[PDB]
Amino acid sequence: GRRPARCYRYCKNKPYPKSRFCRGVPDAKIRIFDLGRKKAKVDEFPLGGHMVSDEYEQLSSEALEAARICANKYMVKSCGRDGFHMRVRLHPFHVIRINKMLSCAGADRLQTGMRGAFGKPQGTVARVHIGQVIMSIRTKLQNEEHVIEALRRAKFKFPGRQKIHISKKWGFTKFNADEFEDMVAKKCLIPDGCGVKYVPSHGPLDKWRVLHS
């Protein structure tokens, strides 16, 4: 029912989002993008490991769903259901089309060949660049090998080449792990849920004195 992904591997078209011009798009295969203990605080999961593409290509929503399921199963097996938090960082926004031909023994049957060849929406894929992050897993610092193995197993659900990278940031934040603790101590960062709020040294002094109090 679905064409091989090699037919839609490369970014050959302009982006074709689901909009008021592209109507009738079927839903993407991936609906859930965050798994594990999403409610875990920032300091709970210091280690962050990403899986990073090396090819400018298109990843299908079915491939993202399969990789998410595989990584979730391995992480639940190894670190337990509350010991990790995974975030898929690719959303299938690019609609791929199909010019369907009649798969019978006849070309006279109104096939028309390449006339009016613009196709109906086949599905959705995500566009990934060289260096872009596909999946992220944050967890305790001692589950580094489990994160690496989960991402390695998830790599097999994707066409191109991917690298595993243990990032230097603290968890899913954009701040370095070595500089995270002192920044929180001096209140440049305030935890809220899975992320932190950066508090710059500007604004009203009332927001400063609600801190330090």
């Binding site: 990403h50 990073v52 992050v133």
Partner: protein, 159 residues
Amino acid sequence: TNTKGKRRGTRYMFSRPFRKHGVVPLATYMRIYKKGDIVDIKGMGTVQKGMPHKCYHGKTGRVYNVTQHAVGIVVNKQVKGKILAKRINVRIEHIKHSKSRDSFLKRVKENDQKKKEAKEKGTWVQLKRQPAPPREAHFVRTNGKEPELLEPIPYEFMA
């Protein structure tokens, strides 16, 4: 297969800049345009009357006729392998004085003054502007400071 409407493809060309909509400032009306002076045709979209065609946006021409609200401009247009001097009527909202002509006439007046002054004081002076000459010989002092040694940095994957 393209339409031939007068304003096809002018969606951004005739749109106003960001946060510069509304009333047209009155200095644009207060400008003075004589015959023979050089104007740039722009074509703002706030004023829909007397608009230039999109092929004259960004062009520069010479004023030959002045009316109550517009001017007549002789502007070169290239059509296939020939350039022809078109004459267009454009309201003054869509034009402004070209500063290249102003700078050139200021240079001419300054050069004439230089000729007069140099003929008064005898000594010759250079008027033709020369292109950027090669740099001349000079000494670069170290000031007792050894130049900093630079080496390429090792690769690391960032994000």
